[PDB]
């Protein structure tokens, strides 16, 4: 435990901060949201496992309690937004040039991704087709 | 017939034709944009 | 031949954007043509592989990607340092999946051969089964269309005799 | 029409297009 | 307002260079449906994936009256995608993702540069290793 929390470097007042968000994806990787339910009955159990496992937070060395369960609890909200669809060019942005995008991403791919999401009329072009389809993709059959 | 080599059972593959053009070419869309009436 | 197990996802990117499957051997190729996160399943899949190829036969399995990033990291050339930070990447990204998918266990796959050349044999890891009891048993009667694939395609060169004393021969009796 | 024949209605109010272009640039803002 | 039109007039507003028009056009078709198809709760991946693709094929079908589109290339970014949506929902939330909807300031390029500059793990090494060494403790409990 404090043999790879030590292999963080040491950054201003942010050591509390940054491992906080570390812990806050380790459980969040590791407890799935089940599709099955929606936002309360899952959210809730996810929530308080993650509570839970805090509890151990003596072994660790520089742990914000209580910005890693605001962090855990954003990271279930924006499943939530990413299950149900997003279109606003600012969680849209953040999604395709990010570090899991890189990854399932080839270079040539990605490359095109950037050419087209930092483009000067990216946002409100995408906030466009975001209405387009949002209104008419029920009419897909 | 002691070589009994294909000469008729050939493979036959289909060449596609079928194409869904867009209204009037890019050419002429950027030219004279359509307007739905 | 060389056996390449890549799962259908990779498969259908492949065939859909029309990367050469000749040169998924070529370590130069396939990381310009693959992302991070196919390469790793690829290793993965490998290593989910349960069958053994018959190696009298010279059908060996593929060496995974990661194996061949992390060899040309160690090798002195002009793009040493880039592979060496490809090889970083695969790590990672592999032990995120390993922990995401542990849950998988008990459960076996469908495979589908698709033969490219005589040097290279696609392996697509399709729909999984969930098998606890005899999952050897499970596996061997589900793969059925697999074992005759693999046997239609060494037929073509190598000595019926010689097939038949493979295990995949027998796979493919013991299925029916 | 959607107002009428005469020309002088036909012309666009100048009050009108620099709220236009106030609410259009907001627009924008919000989207960004 | 037919979508196979309304997304056309849309797609016409991109800036051109020349042939790798068609490479920008398909991904801003793949990324705008890819991010907007909600996804059906009793569906696993593979369905999903099934389903999204048969619209997301039909949707070309129709933009394809209006604008050219390439429809191989198109699908194959839609797929890549999806994929990337569909492994944050099950898997790891990206920290750039709490920052963005989120008092968060400094970055994760802030600590890769260190790491890099001392050549030691990065963020995401570290990240490796916090949920494996909590592997035991998570599926210890419940």
Known sequence: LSRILKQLPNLGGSDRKTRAMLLANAVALQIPFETLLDFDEQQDKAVAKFKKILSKVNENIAVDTKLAVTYFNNILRIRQSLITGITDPCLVKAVLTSDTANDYLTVDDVNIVSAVVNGPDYNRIQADMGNALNQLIGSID | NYNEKSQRDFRVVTIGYNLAASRQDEFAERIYPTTVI | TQVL?????????????????????????????????????????????????????????????????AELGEIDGPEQFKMKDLHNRLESRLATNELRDAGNRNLVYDYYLYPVDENLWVAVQQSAHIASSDPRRVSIQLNHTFFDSMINEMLNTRPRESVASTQIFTYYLESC | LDHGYDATALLETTEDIITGELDDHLESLSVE
């Open chain 3, 5 to 69: 197990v890549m799962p259908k996802a990779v498969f259908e990117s492949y065939k859909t954007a029309g990367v050469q499957f000749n040169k998924l051997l070529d370590t130069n190729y396939i990381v310009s043509e693959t992302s991070v996160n196919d390469l790793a399943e690829i290793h993965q899949a490998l290593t989910a592989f349960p069958f053994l190829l018959p190696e009298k036969l010279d059908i060996k399995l593929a060496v995974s990607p990661i194996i061949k990033v």
